[PDB]
Every structure is written in structure tokens, then in C-alpha cells.
Assembly symmetry: C2
Homo-oligomer: 157 residues x 2
């Protein structure tokens, strides 16, 4: 393909929740462009990453159900172990720019991830929108401060 | 490392208004990164572009003083005459990603312009923040719908 469309749903401790739209991913000469067509989100910047597993299912951790835990960690085929954002090749390949949410809860602003070059790199993985933001660092909080997983979609094929 | 710090000031019909912070420009392997440290803006997305002239002063047009008119138009060394945004090399080279302003009126979210590669490409030009947004197209409104010029900073 030259584009793909990822449906995004809210992540619940019990499974999958409300559909909040889709994200269209296209290839550009500068990398992958993520153009959201979403609603249902808190205004501001949200952590936004490709995660390793093609699942948005919840999982148990320290006694409690965690929404979208089965998506696994940030996509990291080079096993860097480091959350350094979309502009640093020393960290997770799955680190995308923060998702920008408008005051009415829609997300429309397009996001360029220059380190990703082909839609093939997304196949068999998941897209994640977090409750918190992303300062592209593991300091002062791990994983950019994204925290909990709010919405999720699977890229199959 | 080599970075530029561009002070940004409100643009008024009578001249230059109050400072609203600065934008730090850095070079990355993927292009220039504009990291804003601004305040005093309306929440939302603002048209954000490099303009040709190293001035932010106002000027008269069709009988009215226009804020920051002296910056000229969008930087366009290839004379494309088209506004197509930061990801499309068929339009103005000066087209940057829209400036993201938080609910409290501050701008902190960093913006990558992949088509710009060296800080030297910004010397002798200006950075412009518009009142309106930017849909990276000349339709439905020309120049992405940025409209009037709200704040501006000279580089060199
Ligand atoms: Cu994530
Ligand atoms: Cu402009
Ligand atoms: Zn990461
Ligand atoms: Zn333009």
C-alpha cells in the first residue's frame, strides 16, 4: 500500500471500548505521516507510540487489570531499551511525536515520524495513545510520562 | 551545539509590541527543529512560516497599516508560488508545521521542518506566527488560512 487506516478504540480494563475514529498513515519523502481523524480525547499533548504486539487487550499487573497491557512495550526491534522520542535514533523505533488534541477533543494535526520510512515497519504492531504526554525522555518519568493507555488500534496484515 | 535563539514579539499596526518569548532552532539528522518557549498566544494551531525579509515592521497596504507587512511573503527560493506545508517540496520552503499553543496560551511542543537542513538557510529571514491556522494548502483559504500576522522575529 501507499496508505493505511488504523481504527482507534478506547482501552478498558474489561476490553475494547468506544471507537474514537481512525489514523491514516501515509509515506512521504521525509518519513511516515500520521494524520489523525479522532475525537473523544482530552485536549493537549498525548504520548503516541507504536507498541510491539498487535493487540489492544488488557492484562493483569500487580493484582489489577491494566488497559491495553497486551500491546506490550514500545516497538524496539534494535533492543535499545530507551525512550528518546521521534528524533533520536538511539531509542525505541516506535516513538512518535506527541499527539496533538484540540480543545473540542478532536485530533487532526498531522504528525511526521521521520525515523519510520515504510508502512511495512508498522505491520503486526499496534498504535497507542496515552493519558499523559511525552517529553521524549525516561526522565523525570519513564516512557515520556505517557502513563496509562487511553486508546489503541491494531495494524494487522 | 549550534542553535539559533529567535526572540518573538507581538506585531502591531504601529510597530512592535511586547515580547512573547523565544524559539530555539536546532539541527537534527531529520531537519531543523523549532522548539518554542512562548506565551501570550490564543490556544490552538497557528500558521508558522519563514518569511523572506529580515524585518517585522508594519507597512501600509491599500490604505491600511498591516502588522509585520515588511517581512514579505513566505520564503520561496524555488519560486513555487504554492503553499503546501512542511512535508511537500512542491511549495514554499518557508512552510513550517503549525505552531501548537496550549490551553494556557503557551507554546512548548517542538516542531520538525524536514525540508530545512541548516541554520544558515534561516539567516536574513524572519519567523512569523499568524492569527489563523494552517491546513498546508491554498484552499479553501490562501496560504493555509493563516490570515493576519500576530507575532514575528528576525533572524540576523
Ligand atoms: Cu506508548
Ligand atoms: Cu507566514
Ligand atoms: Zn518509547
Ligand atoms: Zn507558504
Amino acid at each position: 500500500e501507499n496508505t493505511l487506516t488504523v481504527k482507534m478504540n478506547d482501552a478498558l480494563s474489561s476490553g475494547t471500548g468506544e471507537n474514537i475514529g481512525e489514523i491514516t498513515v501515509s509515506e512521504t519523502p521525509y518519513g511516515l505521516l500520521f494524520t489523525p481523524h479522532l475525537n473523544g480525547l482530552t485536549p493537549g499533548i498525548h504520548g503516541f507510540h507504536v507498541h510491539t504486539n498487535p493487540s489492544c487487550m488488557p492484562g493483569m499487573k500487580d493484582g489489577k487489570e491494566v488497559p491495553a497491557l497486551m500491546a506490550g512495550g514500545h516497538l524496539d526491534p534494535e533492543k535499545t531499551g530507551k525512550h528518546l522520542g521521534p528524533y533520536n535514533d538511539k531509542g525505541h523505533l516506535g516513538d512518535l511525536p506527541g499527539l496533538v488534541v484540540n480543545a473540542d477533543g478532536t485530533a487532526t494535526y498531522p504528525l511526521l515520524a521521520p525515523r519510520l520510512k515504510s508502512l511495512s515497519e508498522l505491520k503486526g504492531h499496534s498504535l497507542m495513545i496515552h493519558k499523559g504526554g511525552d517529553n521524549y525522555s525516561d526522565k523525570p518519568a519513564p516512557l515520556g510520562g505517557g502513563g496509562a493507555r487511553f486508546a489503541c488500534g491494531v495494524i494487522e496484515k
